Amino acid sequence: STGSATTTPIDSLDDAYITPVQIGTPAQTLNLDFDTGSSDLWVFSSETTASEVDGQTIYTPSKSTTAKLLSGATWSISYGDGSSSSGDVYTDTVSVGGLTVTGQAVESAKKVSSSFTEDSTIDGLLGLAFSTLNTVSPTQQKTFFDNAKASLDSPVFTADLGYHAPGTYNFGFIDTTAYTGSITYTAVSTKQGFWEWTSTGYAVGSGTFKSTSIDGIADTGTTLLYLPATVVSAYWAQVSGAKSSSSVGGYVFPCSATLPSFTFGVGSARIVIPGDYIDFGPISTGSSSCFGGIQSSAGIGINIFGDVALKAAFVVFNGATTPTLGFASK
Numbered sequence: 001s002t003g004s005a006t007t008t009p010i011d012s013l014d015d016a017y018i019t020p021v022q023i024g025t026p027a028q029t030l031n032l033d034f035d036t037g038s039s040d041l042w043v044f045s046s047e048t049t050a051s052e053v054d055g056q057t058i059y060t061p062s063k064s065t066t067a068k069l070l071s072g073a074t075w076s077i078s079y080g081d082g083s084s085s086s087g088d089v090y091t092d093t094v095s096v097g098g099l100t101v102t103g104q105a106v107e108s109a110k111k112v113s114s115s116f117t118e119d120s121t122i123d124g125l126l127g128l129a130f131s132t133l134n135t136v137s138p139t140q141q142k143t144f145f146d147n148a149k150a151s152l153d154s155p156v157f158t159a160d161l162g163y164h165a166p167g168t169y170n171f172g173f174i175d176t177t178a179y180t181g182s183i184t185y186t187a188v189s190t191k192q193g194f195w196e197w198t199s200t201g202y203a204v205g206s207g208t209f210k211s212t213s214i215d216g217i218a219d220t221g222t223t224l225l226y227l228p229a230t231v232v233s234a235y236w237a238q239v240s241g242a243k244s245s246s247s248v249g250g251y252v253f254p255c256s257a258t259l260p261s262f263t264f265g266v267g268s269a270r271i272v273i274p275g276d277y278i279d280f281g282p283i284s285t286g287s288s289s290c291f292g293g294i295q296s297s298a299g300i301g302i303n304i305f306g307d308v309a310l311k312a313a314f315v316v317f318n319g320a321t322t323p324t325l326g327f328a329s330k
């Protein structure tokens with residue numbers, strides 16, 4: 001089997017991407033944030049504290065003839081940005097782009113933190129990291145991809161995120177029309193539960209490529225590109241007036257600037273992030289200070305190849321017995 005679903009930016013800055021997901025019988029369609037940096041499929045629901053729902057579409061398990069309470073199961077997740085959610089668990093039929101999994105754990109939120117309430121466009125998360133990170137207790141549950149993978153024509157999914165435009169998540173096949181050149185594959189460590197790999201270096205604009213190993217994770221659920229402070233300083237030094245602002249929480253730059261590109265290495269191959277992808281717009285409405293799309297990972301403990309990087313590539317998440325990642329230009 002295969003599936004193919006369009007993923008759409010939630011706003012004009014590509015702050016996140018939402019993909020429609022059918023849950024239950026009859027189908028209830030929710031727009032979920034596909035997140036290769038976490039491993040829980042959780043949704044706003046009829047159980048979510050009413051004051052914490054503000055415009056999201058909710059899953060109502062009592063209206064689904066295939067929903068079953070997973071007795072005694074609870075879940076609770078805290079993400080790196082300090083956001084969180086928790087609740088109980090149903091199993092139900094879940095379909096993405098024509099690919100159907102029966103018995104998928106659907107984690108129903110009883111509580112969500114403020115930043116989830118405030119994103120009216122995101123009805124929940126669909127985790128695509130490794131199932132070892134799933135938070136369901138006392139019986140850990142599998143991701144949608146892990147449940148689907150035996151049925152898939154090939155045990156892979158691909159992320160093809162657009163810059164200020166829709167893109168595609170495919171399951172079970174690699175669309176050879178969706179990229180240019182060849183896909184370069186690179187090793188993955190699953191030891192932390194992430195799609196963790198080692199980039200071979202970077203270049204800033206037209207500058208020379210610096211060969212240096214940068215371990216990090218391919219995380220569709222993170223907006224920006226978080227890299228070591230040395231790398232990020234070298235990037236922003238090429239932008240007149242750019243500075244790190246403690247009050248804003250990262251590098252800012254004059255909105256009048258034209259940003260240089262940023263290249264990252266995948267083996268001997270190179271992915272070029274155009275400068276415009278690194279512009280996240282005014283720090284506040286009407287400001288002439290703009291927020292940068294490349295930020296330091298120094299306070300995080302891990303480097304993160306988020307959407308800023310991934311959207312410049314066609315990315316293969318290969319879930320074979322030994323997982324690997326593949327990157328192609330497009």
Ligand SMILES: c1c[nH]c(C2CNC2)n1
Binds near residue numbers: 033081119
């Ligand atoms: C999807 C990813 N991140 C989020 C919340 C936490 N910041 C807003 N929703």
Ligand SMILES: c1c[nH]c(C2CNC2)n1
Binds near residue numbers: 219221
């Ligand atoms: C809130 C939801 N997901 C996340 C991170 C994990 N990958 C992005 N924060």
